């Protein structure tokens, strides 16, 4: 609570998960995952990995409560996939954040 920022929405990338069943599952379900991230200001982290880790957890936690509010649930596959794409977005956010303030 408090201290968070919301990144701008990002184009959803084509993501390949390495097997036939997951690629299809992802293509069909990817709309259920965030297209923007919540994070704390980049200055508050010792490096990229630290920022990213927290950005991922914060974003997924908040997305999960809003999803629960709608009466929906994430499976273990959902969490694994969401983790991956949110990680990509957090990396992009850090790079942009790191560039600013530098």
């Amino acid at each position, epitope marked *: 609570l408090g201290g968070y920022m919301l990144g701008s929405a990002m184009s959803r990338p084509m993501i*390949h*998960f*390495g*097997n*036939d*069943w*997951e*690629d299809r599952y992802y293509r069909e379900n990817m709309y259920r995952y965030p297209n923007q991230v919540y994070y704390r200001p980049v200055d508050q982290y010792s490096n990229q990995n630290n920022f990213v880790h927290d950005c991922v957890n914060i974003t997924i936690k908040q997305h999960t409560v809003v999803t629960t509010t709608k009466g929906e649930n994430f499976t273990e596959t959902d969490v694994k996939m969401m983790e*991956r794409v949110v*990680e*990509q977005m957090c*990396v992009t956010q850090y790079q942009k954040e790191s560039q600013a303030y530098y």
Partner: antibody
Amino acid sequence: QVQLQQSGTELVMPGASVKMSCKASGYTFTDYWMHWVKQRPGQGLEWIGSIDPSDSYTSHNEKFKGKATLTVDESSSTAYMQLSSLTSEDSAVYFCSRSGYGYYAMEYWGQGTSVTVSS
Amino acid sequence: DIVLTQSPAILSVSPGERVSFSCRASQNIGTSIHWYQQRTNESPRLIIKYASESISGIPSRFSGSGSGTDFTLSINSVESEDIADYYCQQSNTWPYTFGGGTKLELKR
């Protein structure tokens, strides 16, 4: 023409680690998954693990998780597998291979790196 | 884990003969089975993908059929260069798994 270049051989001491390279050429490196497959002398193929070069997301055969570390170097279009704490059980040929675009037949194969673990 | 069982483990064949061998999966994998040929001291080579789809530069004598759990690779007319080990592999879900292989040898 797609090529996957692997070193021919590695001689490794028991307990040591080895890092094997697989250098890709002839296509857009980040568009395709790369895979690593083990074959013991006179035995069959065993999947070790695979990597998506776009973000270095990986998947492992459960028994290689903690043993085989997969990375890529996007700038040199090279995939690496590091095997640690080698024993004679690790004496084998290791192939890298590349699948299709959103399809997972292993379309291209390296020539394999033959690893011998011995003191 | 999806277990892939190949049979027979060894097949003796006469040049020119039509041969087939089978790969059976412990669970339904749709058409997510691929076949590889591996000659002595060589890398495997993709021969048929997704049960039945042909591969560029592979002889038309190779074909595959099946969907679900029971798959077959057939060679219309066996040639000496086809003497090799043959493996199936599934890519439907993790972990990838391989059959134990079928070895082709010449009957004499």
